[PDB]
Amino acid sequence: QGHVSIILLGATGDLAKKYLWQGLFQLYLDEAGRGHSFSFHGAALTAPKQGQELMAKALESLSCPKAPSHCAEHKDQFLQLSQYRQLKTAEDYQALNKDIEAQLQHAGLREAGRIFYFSVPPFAYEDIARNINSSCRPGPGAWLRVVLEKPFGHDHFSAQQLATELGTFFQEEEMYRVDHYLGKQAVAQILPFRDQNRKALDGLWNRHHVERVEIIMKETVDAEGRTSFYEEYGVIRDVLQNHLTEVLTLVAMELPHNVSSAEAVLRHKLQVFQALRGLQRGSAVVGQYQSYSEQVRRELQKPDSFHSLTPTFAAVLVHIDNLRWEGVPFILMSGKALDERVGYARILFKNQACCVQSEKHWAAAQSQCLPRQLVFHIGHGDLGSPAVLVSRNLFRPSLPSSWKEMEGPPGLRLFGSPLSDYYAYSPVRERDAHSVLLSHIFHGRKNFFITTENLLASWNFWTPLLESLAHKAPRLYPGGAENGRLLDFEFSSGRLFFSQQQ
Amino acid sequence: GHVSIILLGATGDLAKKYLWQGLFQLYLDEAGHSFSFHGAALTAPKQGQELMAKALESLSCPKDMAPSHCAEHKDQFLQLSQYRQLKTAEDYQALNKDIEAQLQHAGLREAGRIFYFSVPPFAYEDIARNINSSCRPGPGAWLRVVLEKPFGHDHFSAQQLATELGTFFQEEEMYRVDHYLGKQAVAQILPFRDQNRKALDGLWNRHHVERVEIIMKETVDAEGRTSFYEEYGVIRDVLQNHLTEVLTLVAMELPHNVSSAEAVLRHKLQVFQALRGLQRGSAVVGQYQSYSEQVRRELQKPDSFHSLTPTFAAVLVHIDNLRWEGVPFILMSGKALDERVGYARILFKNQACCVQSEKHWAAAQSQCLPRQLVFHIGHGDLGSPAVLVSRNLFRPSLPSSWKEMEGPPGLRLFGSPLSDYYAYSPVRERDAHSVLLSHIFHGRKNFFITTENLLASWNFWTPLLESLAHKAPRLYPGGAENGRLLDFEFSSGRLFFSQQ
Ligand SMILES: *[C@@H]1O[C@H](CO)[C@@H](O)[C@H](O)[C@H]1NC(C)=O
């Protein structure tokens, strides 16, 4: 019960038009008619009338989920509630304050909060936040949940500097650092999956029961339309640091007695960040596709001849010095312009049985000589949808009513094994990442977000690898299906090396 | 070089089941060096004479060579074969005189004498000294004595029998044979490790081997053999003597050369002294449902008797070296099971991650496919001896006696198409007993059980025999019905049944 105001401070960019406006809408569509009033203040540096026209075009670009009365009433209310305003000068911020209290007077209720989504380019951060602190603070006990974007820095030093410079203005409890990959429906089912299936998996998470762990994100689309974001950032900081490390610290984490608790999850994942081996020179292998250097050459004009050392595919080996993962290797690899686009967290058990019966009667749900594995399929690939795949000989898993037993094509091969072998589950309704992330911002659930202790622990993990890998020339690959086995690699002891030397 | 071979078990069925055929094959391989062949039994001499004539009637031959030469070679072997009845020491003196008479008939020279024992063990003593007192050969000749596969039931009986027979004959002049040491791929593990010196020296580690399996599965239950089987058991008849020997063959550190034929004998004991002890949790034990009724029927036993004799046994072996400290070695054998297979499988752990798709994985280049090195020896889906090397590992190098195998497609060995393997096969199918008799005539001693290694292998299973002296076996229905009843797992250093 209370009016909640959501303001999108960023300039209307590409992803601002693509994902976020549909996200806020969907956010309005879930919680409408529950005593919560709303105000969707479009904010940018553009003209007010032109901003109103562009933002109304954005409101007309939205699509309701698959009744015409539902679409008509909710699109009319969404056109009524949302309003653009100019954000060029400092006194326009208290003009926004006047607008917010005016819309509170129209709502006739008590203020509940003020969400300030940031999407601005990183040329300036202190002026907008200091104007928010000057005027745009809320009233009687309303919270102020601001959200920052993905680029946080290039080392631990810049990340710490920006964390203190932005935590001067706002509390760290108020802030919501968004992770895209934590909103994916299979990543968000890892800890609940371990929660209602701890009776038959906690006896198997050990070092003496797990062969290997692979956290995989393959992509076919290269750096098209996104080159200038990529030459400074690199694939280690792009996906491994902010997506793969968080699912890595989600699988290898001691579960608390209440996963629904907030702070226990972050303290246990900090425990995982403290109980892991450091990274060396030889624990990582990198590559870049041949079109990347000439793409950077043709996108930015620099004198003489230039060759970029930016990694585009990377594989790292991670060991966790514990009583749980002492000998288990953890492979995190990702790259673009590969031969496939897929994403999965796959834990592979070790072979420990000899079967008296031959392969003529090796049933999928009975014998223990067929491989045992758990796959969290995030999406794409041959399956497309997100999935939870259990080997049938392990156990019968329990998943909530949001997921159901799916029936894919029989005989489809995943890691050399037929699909029929897996107990496969898929969600009963697909949801975007940003929609559930904005719903969690509105609900104030900080379990799916990043605190600065976790961010600096991640940067202290990853920075020695980055400064060691800052002078190695990567191995070129043609990309697509023409790669063959040029990027394949082995792990020997705590070191990674390519299969086919050159 | 006239050699006098005497078979002392002519009344037995195994004499003309394998031994007469092996002696005929030895003549066919070695026909000029003179030969003489004599037989002996505790049988009436006319009945013994018609019996060895009947044994000489049933003689097979290779099909490649012409039957016209086969007929005259068979007539020559019929000429050289003789029989003699033995009761008292004067009869063995007459045997020595008849041996000298055969020297004066053809080839007046004693190259040596060979004695083959096939009698039941309780008469092994006195006949032996009947050889020792009078039937010794000449000055420059040698004497060879061959004994059968039983060597007692523990280290106590093996030590007693070895010390009883060590008085008459020396270690240098005594030969011991087991049944499955004559297999050609069993005789090919050390030549394979010898030839692949540059390729396989960096892979015989703890760093690359996941597990080692040695299986000898059977589908035939002992029907009339169960009187012999009841006091012996599956551990003593195959696991103690054949599977242990192959294990030592694959686990021993290879010498400077195998042709020296002496460092092979001493490098085998280093596997024995480094083998850790066997506990009662290292073995699983089963029997089929009809074995109790089988011992109840032929042997005079009460109707409430339930034997505890094992027919199926799986044991776990750990060695403790700088090579294979944590690698498990699973030895399995059984009766009335599904597939009559015999092989020795080496499995390597999964080491690679492959970027390219599973639909584009070459059998000869992608390391994500399983790597294996299999010595198949008997009666599988192949039906022939084979040395299977997966193509992603390395290109194997076998000698001229082994050819590359043309395998039919649609064949699944260890979950993989035969194509995946670089399989090989011998040119000539030679039996085990024939090449063992050829080695007995040759005197190479690397293919025979010595006195030290026999006792070294008996005290390793005697605590397991005493530990499982009262454990009830698992009663499986037998045949193909035992799907998952006999499946087992190894947890650390323990074995347990999957089903309760
Ligand atoms: C808001 O930010 C300004 C920036 O200088 C700071 O002075 C002020 O203390 C902040 N207000 C808080 C933390 O309540």
Swiss-Prot record, chain A:
Residues given in the record as NADP(+) 2 binding sites: R346
Pathway(s) where this gene product acts: Carbohydrate degradation; pentose phosphate pathway; D-ribulose 5-phosphate from D-glucose 6-phosphate (oxidative stage): step 1/3; Carbohydrate degradation; pentose phosphate pathway; D-ribulose 5-phosphate from D-glucose 6-phosphate (oxidative stage): step 2/3; Carbohydrate degradation; pentose phosphate pathway; D-ribulose 5-phosphate from D-glucose 6-phosphate (oxidative stage)
Chief place where the protein resides: endoplasmic reticulum
Keywords: Carbohydrate metabolism, Disease variant, Endoplasmic reticulum, Glucose metabolism, Glycoprotein, Hydrolase, Multifunctional enzyme, NAD, NADP, Oxidoreductase, Pyrrolidone carboxylic acid, Signal
Repeat listed as a keyword: no
Tissues with expression: Present in most tissues examined, strongest in liver.
Record localization: Endoplasmic reticulum lumen
GO CC term (a single one): sarcoplasmic reticulum
Modification N6-succinyllysine, positions: K184
Task performed by this protein: Bifunctional enzyme localized in the lumen of the endoplasmic reticulum that catalyzes the first two steps of the oxidative branch of the pentose phosphate pathway/shunt, an alternative to glycolysis and a major source of reducing power and metabolic intermediates for biosynthetic processes. Has a hexose-6-phosphate dehydrogenase activity, with broad substrate specificity compared to glucose-6-phosphate 1-dehydrogenase/G6PD, and catalyzes the first step of the pentose phosphate pathway.
Assembly behavior: Homodimer.
Family statement drawn from the similarity comment of this UniProt entry: In the N-terminal section; belongs to the glucose-6-phosphate dehydrogenase family.
Disease in which the protein is involved: Cortisone reductase deficiency 1: An autosomal recessive error of cortisone metabolism characterized by a failure to regenerate cortisol from cortisone, resulting in increased cortisol clearance, activation of the hypothalamic-pituitary axis and ACTH-mediated adrenal androgen excess. Clinical features include hyperandrogenism resulting in hirsutism, oligo-amenorrhea, and infertility in females and premature pseudopuberty in males.
Designated name of the protein: GDH/6PGL endoplasmic bifunctional protein
UniProt source species: Homo sapiens
Lineage: Eukaryota, Metazoa, Chordata, Craniata, Vertebrata
Originating gene: H6PD
Residues of the full protein shown: 23 to 526 of 791
